[PDB]
Ligand binder design. Structure first.
Ligand SMILES: CC(C)(COP(=O)(O)OP(=O)(O)OC[C@H]1O[C@@H](n2cnc3c(N)ncnc32)[C@H](O)[C@@H]1OP(=O)(O)O)[C@@H](O)C(=O)NCCC(=O)NCCSC(=O)CC(=O)O
Lengths: 146, 618, 146, 34
């Protein structure tokens, strides 16, 4: 078991024991038997983490939001009884990306064969008109050449 | 400590021009240039952007870029003092180079550390005198921001290139000289990419007076191939292009068949006189060395300065070299009657027009060609034909000339890239377009353009190749859904520090009729559910039935809820993994620990699904 | 008169070098020789433009950096790539690299790689001082007091 | 009227520096510099 996965069935002080090393049948039985230490698991999370609630619905949205704090971004990939969940899933990931998580939305579709077709529009125009040009810098003046 | 030598081996593959960007007169970007060219819009105007229309008696009309007072100093890591004591040409060129890099599907991280050479061509150094007339302390930073040797080097320093960075000054034919150098270095194996480019901005009216005293300039706009032509009009450009090996290029406007250079020598008509023989010999050599059938040329981007001594000789050389054997008129044209003469950026202008002709597949019209020049017999014999209106260039070879003052000629040939688009399975289903920029308005415009091309997947791929830049470079991160029933758009400023992506898995109670039904639109989600249903079928569970036609009474039981929740969790995990999201931490509630194990690599799809099945069975 | 002294001295030096190699004006005339002058200094322009008057237009053909190799090509009748380079303190070797590149492919058989640099403006030295480029005494190469 | 193309072929032989000249500080020629 990698350190990324935070166990929510074994107490923090017992993580170093051999039982908390593999997710074998013993781990499943212990999780199904022992209590769930959700709050403790959510304490190791940083103060500005981006927690994605992967589930059929945003069940633990309120619980997680209260547990984490104020500086942690929270997103749910699904919404109950939603007329359209695909849009909800895309909006959730768009929110996640907007807060600084890399991803490849095109990984859900067959990869495009490069080089692309010559009919692809130009991306230079978009970047040209998407600069931060608030400040005005010095430019040569006619009076300086005389 | 020992350093591994680089494998400097000659390259024999194709070289493709992948990116293009630049500022042109009355055109803030390439798109505006293309629109103006194809609408017969004259880009040489009369105003007081640089000086009064007639100051010191200089010609009133000139080709001037929209603005040269703008620069995103913070993006390129240049402090206020350096940016202030910095040539506007180099600032605009740096912006144009970044735009061209992004255009070719490249990004800051991808191009960092590559064996790329920079071959900027700049000759204007007029900002040195103005800044030195009233020199004061703190102006010393001009050495690192004003020297001509700092145009390519800064590009090397900012983008972290580790290839030959040199500045060239060949006059009106410098851009194609840099292209020649890039071809030379690419073929020897030193570099894999090139940032060939060049900028030219007019600042000193006395320079215009100096050119006038030599009869260089005319009265009206450049009358290319016109009997009344008497000179050229100065222009401004800050264009740049990116070249890459065709095998590693994510976008190919065209292919560089070959470019070469030559000189005129001791001509009896003066140093400032074109040599028809020299240009003809250069053309013959280039079409013979590469075994290119000169009769295959479809469009010819001529160096139409508009003078009475330049156009006739260039046309004669073209007729003798490329029109020999042609059974149809050869369409000639120039980009000087549209925006004037760019001086040290004329060749880049021709490259820009060629990459526009071969991208839009239409030859831009030529302006001011009213009466054919009587000294150009090719226009009356049917061998030559100026393209006065939009002509449908289908495909083939396009040739460019650049005859610099002093006799240094240059020729180059490009082969069109014919890979017309084919439909993608996407472009009719919702997609998540994610990107980043420096300003909210810029990102909004980017999303508007993406919506304009919602039916193009290749465009989305090109955007995505540079949509993962760190927040430091592009703090404004945004996302929008193309082909969406309901409009969605988010734009936020993300600090430089990177936040942690933690996965949280829910447990029981997330059940409901239709769970994951909509997400079946995604291929990966459906595939994952199918590959899990096949696993659970031998155990008496038909996952597909419970998930699609399942009812509330079915979900009231113990088995179907556990099975469906795990299936959704695993399918969503597969969706996230395919999209390329790596979780820095994983936590889960009871019944979600199996999903955490699956996403963590400690378990498998079979193990996780059967673990949930065993739990609910017990 | 309206020509850079650097260009004049370079032309004389180029002729001297040609004669030194056992070559002559008639022998090198018409040969496929490339010129790769490296020049960056352009202080001769501001002085001549401070009091610009008619008949000074000839500076374009005697003052522009692009005319250094071109004049050499014009006078000696060379018919090879004549280009001007500016790579700061290492331009002279970049010209050598370009000459090697052009010679090993077959465009030219000879090269006139060179370089000139004269100091005219007393303010450029002040510019270099402001960056701490220049020292007090003569270059103390490999000296602890450099 | 037709122009014979030049034989642009890669060269594999040696490159020799044949002549040298120049003005150097306090040296009117190469000999004074030496
Ligand atoms: C109280 C809760 C159930 C949630 O109730 P709340 O109403 O207070 O939460 P909330 O208002 O913020 O949002 C509730 C979200 O979840 C959905 N939701 C709420 N109640 C639901 C229910 N009975 N059935 C189906 N969906 C429900 C809502 O649609 C809503 O979706 P949206 O917000 O998207 O619109 C949760 O806090 C919780 O976890 N309770 C304990 C469950 C548990 O941990 N059991 C442990 C073992 S069970 C297990 O894992 C199996 C096993 O042990 O083997």
């Amino acid at each position: 078991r990698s350190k990324k996965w935070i166990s929510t069935s074994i107490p923090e002080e017992r993580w170093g024991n051999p039982e908390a090393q593999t997710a074998d049948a013993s781990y499943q039985a212990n999780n199904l038997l022992s209590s769930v230490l959700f709050y403790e698991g959510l304490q190791k999370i940083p103060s500005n983490a981006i927690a994605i609630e992967i589930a059929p619905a945003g069940l633990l949205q309120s619980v997680i939001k209260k547990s984490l704090g104020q500086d942690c971004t929270i997103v749910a990939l699904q919404k109950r009884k939603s007329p359209n969940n695909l849009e909800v899933f895309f909006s959730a990931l768009g929110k996640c990306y907007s807060h600084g998580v890399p991803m490849n939305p095109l990984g859900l579709y067959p990869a495009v064969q490069f080089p692309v077709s010559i009919d692809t529009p130009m991306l230079s125009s978009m970047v040209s008109e998407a600069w931060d040009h608030s400040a005005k810098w010095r430019v040569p003046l006619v009076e300086e050449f005389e | 400590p020992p350093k591994t030598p680089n494998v400097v081996e000659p390259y024999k593959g194709e070289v493709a021009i992948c990116g293009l960007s630049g500022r042109y007169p009355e055109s803030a970007n390439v798109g505006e240039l293309e629109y103006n060219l194809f609408n017969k819009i004259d880009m040489v105007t009369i105003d007081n952007r640089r000086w009064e229309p007639g100051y010191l008696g200089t010609p009133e009309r000139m080709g001037k870029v929209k603005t040269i007072t703008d620069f995103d100093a913070e993006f390129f890591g240049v402090h206020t003092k350096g940016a202030q004591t910095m040539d506007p040409m180099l600032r605009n060129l740096l912006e144009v180079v970044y735009e061209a890099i992004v255009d070719a599907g490249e990004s800051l991280e991808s191009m960092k550390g590559t064996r790329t050479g920079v071959y900027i061509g700049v000759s204007n150094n007029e900002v040195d005198t103005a800044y030195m007339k009233n020199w004061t302390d703190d102006d010393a930073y001009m050495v690192q921001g004003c020297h001509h040797s700092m145009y390519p080097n800064w590009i090397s320093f900012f983008f972290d290139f580790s290839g030959p960075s040199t500045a060239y000054n060949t006059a009106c034919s410098t851009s194609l000289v840099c292209l020649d150098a890039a071809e030379r270095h690419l073929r020897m194996g030193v570099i894999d990419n090139a940032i060939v480019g060049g900028s030219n901005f007019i600042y000193r009216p006395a320079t215009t007076k100096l050119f006038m005293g030599m009869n260089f300039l005319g009265s009206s706009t450049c009358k290319a191939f016109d009997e009344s032509g008497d000179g050229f009009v100065r222009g401004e450009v800050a264009s740049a292009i990116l070249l890459k090996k065709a095998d590693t290029a994510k976008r190919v406007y065209c292919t560089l068949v070959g470019s070469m250079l030559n000189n005129d020598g001791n001509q009896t008509n003066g140093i400032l006189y074109p040599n028809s023989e020299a240009q003809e010999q250069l053309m013959t050599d280039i079409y013979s060395t590469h075994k290119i059938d000169a009769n295959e040329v479809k469009y010819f981007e001529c160096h139409g300065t508009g003078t009475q001594a330049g156009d006739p000789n260039e046309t004669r050389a073209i007729c003798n070299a490329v029109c020999k054997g042609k059974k149809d008129p050869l369409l000639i044209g120039s980009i000087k009657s549209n925006l004037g003469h760019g001086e040290t950026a004329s060749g880049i202008n021709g490259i820009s027009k060629v990459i526009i002709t071969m991208h839009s597949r239409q030859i831009p019209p030529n302006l001011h060609f009213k009466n054919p020049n009587p000294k150009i017999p090719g226009l009356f014999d049917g061998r030559l034909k100026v393209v006065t209106e939009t002509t449908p260039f289908d495909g083939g070879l396009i040739a460019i000339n650049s005859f610099g003052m002093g006799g240094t000629n240059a020729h180059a040939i490009f082969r069109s890239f014919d890979k017309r688009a084919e439909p993608h399975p996407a472009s009719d289903k919702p997609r998540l377009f994610t990107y980043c920029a420096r300003t909210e308005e810029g990102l909004q415009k980017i999303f508007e353009e993406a919506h304009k091309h919602a039916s193009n997947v290749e465009f989305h791929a090109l955007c995505q190749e540079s949509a993962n830049t760190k927040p430091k470079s592009l703090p404004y991160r945004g996302a929008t859904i193309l082909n969406a029933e309901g409009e969605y758009t988010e734009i936020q400023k993300c600090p430089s520090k990177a936040r942690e992506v933690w996965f949280v898995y829910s447990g029981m109670g997330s059940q409901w009729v239709g769970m994951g039904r909509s997400l079946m639109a995604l291929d990966v989600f459906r595939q994952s559910i199918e590959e899990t249903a096949a696993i659970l079928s031998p155990f008496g569970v038909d996952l597909m039935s419970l998930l699609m036609d399942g009812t509330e009474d079915k979900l009231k039981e113990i088995m179907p809820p556990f099975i469906c929740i795990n299936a959704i969790q695993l399918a969503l995990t597969d969706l996230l993994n395919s999209m390329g999201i790596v979780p820095d931490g994983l936590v889960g509630h009871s019944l979600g620990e199996v999903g955490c194990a699956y996403a963590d690599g400690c378990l498998t799809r079979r193990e996780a699904i059967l673990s949930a099945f065993w739990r609910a069975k017990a």
